[PDB]
Design an enzyme around this catalytic site. Structure first.
Site, PDB file in Angstrom:
ATOM      1  N   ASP A  60       0.779  -1.222   0.000  1.00 28.22           N
ATOM      2  CA  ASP A  60       0.000   0.000   0.000  1.00 28.22           C
ATOM      3  C   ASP A  60       0.818   1.283   0.000  1.00 28.22           C
ATOM      4  O   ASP A  60       1.830   1.366   0.690  1.00 28.22           O
ATOM      5  CB  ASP A  60      -0.835   0.049   1.299  1.00 28.22           C
ATOM      6  CG  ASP A  60      -2.270   0.465   1.102  1.00 28.22           C
ATOM      7  OD1 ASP A  60      -2.870   0.174   0.051  1.00 28.22           O
ATOM      8  OD2 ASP A  60      -2.828   1.098   2.025  1.00 28.22           O
ATOM      9  N   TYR A  62       1.890   5.009   1.255  1.00 26.58           N
ATOM     10  CA  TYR A  62       1.679   5.787   2.482  1.00 26.58           C
ATOM     11  C   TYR A  62       0.387   6.600   2.447  1.00 26.58           C
ATOM     12  O   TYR A  62       0.067   7.141   1.375  1.00 26.58           O
ATOM     13  CB  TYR A  62       2.828   6.773   2.680  1.00 26.58           C
ATOM     14  CG  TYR A  62       4.150   6.121   3.036  1.00 26.58           C
ATOM     15  CD1 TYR A  62       4.301   5.284   4.129  1.00 26.58           C
ATOM     16  CD2 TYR A  62       5.252   6.381   2.244  1.00 26.58           C
ATOM     17  CE1 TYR A  62       5.531   4.714   4.415  1.00 26.58           C
ATOM     18  CE2 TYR A  62       6.480   5.826   2.506  1.00 26.58           C
ATOM     19  CZ  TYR A  62       6.605   4.999   3.597  1.00 26.58           C
ATOM     20  OH  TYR A  62       7.829   4.443   3.858  1.00 26.58           O
ATOM     21  N   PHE A  73       7.800   2.810  -0.439  1.00 29.04           N
ATOM     22  CA  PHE A  73       8.569   3.158   0.748  1.00 29.04           C
ATOM     23  C   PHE A  73       9.133   4.568   0.822  1.00 29.04           C
ATOM     24  O   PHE A  73       9.577   5.003   1.903  1.00 29.04           O
ATOM     25  CB  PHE A  73       9.741   2.161   0.887  1.00 29.04           C
ATOM     26  CG  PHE A  73       9.149   0.777   1.171  1.00 29.04           C
ATOM     27  CD1 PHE A  73       8.517   0.481   2.369  1.00 29.04           C
ATOM     28  CD2 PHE A  73       9.255  -0.202   0.200  1.00 29.04           C
ATOM     29  CE1 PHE A  73       8.009  -0.793   2.603  1.00 29.04           C
ATOM     30  CE2 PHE A  73       8.750  -1.471   0.428  1.00 29.04           C
ATOM     31  CZ  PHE A  73       8.149  -1.779   1.625  1.00 29.04           C
ATOM     32  N   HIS A 183       8.773  -8.306   6.594  1.00 31.36           N
ATOM     33  CA  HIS A 183       8.595  -6.899   6.233  1.00 31.36           C
ATOM     34  C   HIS A 183       9.339  -5.964   7.169  1.00 31.36           C
ATOM     35  O   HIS A 183       9.503  -6.224   8.379  1.00 31.36           O
ATOM     36  CB  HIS A 183       7.076  -6.645   6.215  1.00 31.36           C
ATOM     37  CG  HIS A 183       6.698  -5.338   5.599  1.00 31.36           C
ATOM     38  ND1 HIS A 183       6.841  -4.164   6.310  1.00 31.36           N
ATOM     39  CD2 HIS A 183       6.217  -4.990   4.388  1.00 31.36           C
ATOM     40  CE1 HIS A 183       6.456  -3.151   5.547  1.00 31.36           C
ATOM     41  NE2 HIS A 183       6.070  -3.630   4.377  1.00 31.36           N
TER      42      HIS A 183
HETATM   43  O1  LIG Z   1       4.981   2.891  -0.452  1.00 29.82           O
HETATM   44  C1  LIG Z   1       4.869   2.118   0.515  1.00 29.82           C
HETATM   45  C2  LIG Z   1       4.813   2.639   1.871  1.00 29.82           C
HETATM   46  C3  LIG Z   1       4.637   1.816   2.919  1.00 29.82           C
HETATM   47  N1  LIG Z   1       4.456   0.461   2.759  1.00 29.82           N
HETATM   48  C4  LIG Z   1       4.463  -0.130   1.499  1.00 29.82           C
HETATM   49  O2  LIG Z   1       4.308  -1.330   1.291  1.00 29.82           O
HETATM   50  N2  LIG Z   1       4.774   0.727   0.472  1.00 29.82           N
END
Ligand SMILES: O=c1cc[nH]c(=O)[nH]1
EC number: 3.2.2.27
Length: 225
Positions: A60, A62, A73, A183
């Site tokens: 997902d 942010y 990320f 993760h």
């Molecule tokens: O872009 C992102 C941010 C947080 N966690 C995820 O998996 N990806």
């Protein structure tokens, strides 16, 4: 051979176009959607198909203001480094020679070196994680991963967490290099993310095939006169 070449027919599929219409609706419904529409596909913009060296899958985007900008990320300049990225930087600091804690969380320069920073879901409702997970994005990124599997050779995949690991089950482990770990988020990072040494391992593989390794120290766009 480009993303558009291999994705043009997927992008005319109802599941895909309808995903985009649902987002465009949502953006006008009273809710804010992240990232901005111009940024949704930035992973593709900064790392062309023929430029992919490392794939890091996220799930997902942010979901706070100013955070997501289309690269898994990463956050924009000036934004605090979120806990998943902090844990990534920690592993890096403990494994990559000379690495020190960056003062920012902007990963564009990873992407410019061929690190494909691909979330499986490409949009999210403000403050509501996983809110668009049942649109058709997973079908689209299923197709993306399948095409990389097929059209490239010797790519390294870093698969962090069960979701990403399932996503990458189809990848040819003989033609590509697949590394798994828990993760980096605070909930799981101390249960095997730390110690996974994925950044060094990726570089060595790249080196052992004549590819430049990744400089994992991320860098901010510079100032001009
Ligand atoms: O872009 C992102 C941010 C947080 N966690 C995820 O998996 N990806």
């Amino acid at each position: 051979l480009t993303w558009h070449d291999v994705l043009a027919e997927e992008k005319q599929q109802p599941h895909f176009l309808n995903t985009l219409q649902t987002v465009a609706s949502e953006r006008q419904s009273g809710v804010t959607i992240y990232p901005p529409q111009k940024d949704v596909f930035n992973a593709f913009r900064f790392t062309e198909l023929g430029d992919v060296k490392v794939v890091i899958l996220g799930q997902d985007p942010y979901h706070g203001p100013g955070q997501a900008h289309g690269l898994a990320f990463s956050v924009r300049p000036g934004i605090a480094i979120p806990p998943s990225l902090l844990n990534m930087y920690k592993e890096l600091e403990n494994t990559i020679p000379g690495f020190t804690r960056p003062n920012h969380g902007y990963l564009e320069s990873w992407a410019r070196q061929g690190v494909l920073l691909l979330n499986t879901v490409l949009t999210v409702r403000a403050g509501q994680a996983h809110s668009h997970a049942s649109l058709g994005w997973e079908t689209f990124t299923d197709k993306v991963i399948s095409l990389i599997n097929q059209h490239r050779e010797g790519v390294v995949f870093l698969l962090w967490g069960s979701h990403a690991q399932k996503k990458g089950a189809i990848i040819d482990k003989q033609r590509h290099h697949v590394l798994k770990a828990p993760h980096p988020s605070p909930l799981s990072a101390h249960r095997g993310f730390f110690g996974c040494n994925h950044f060094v391992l990726a570089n060595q593989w790249l080196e052992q095939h004549g590819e430049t390794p990744i400089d994992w120290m991320p860098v901010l766009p510079a100032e001009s006169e």
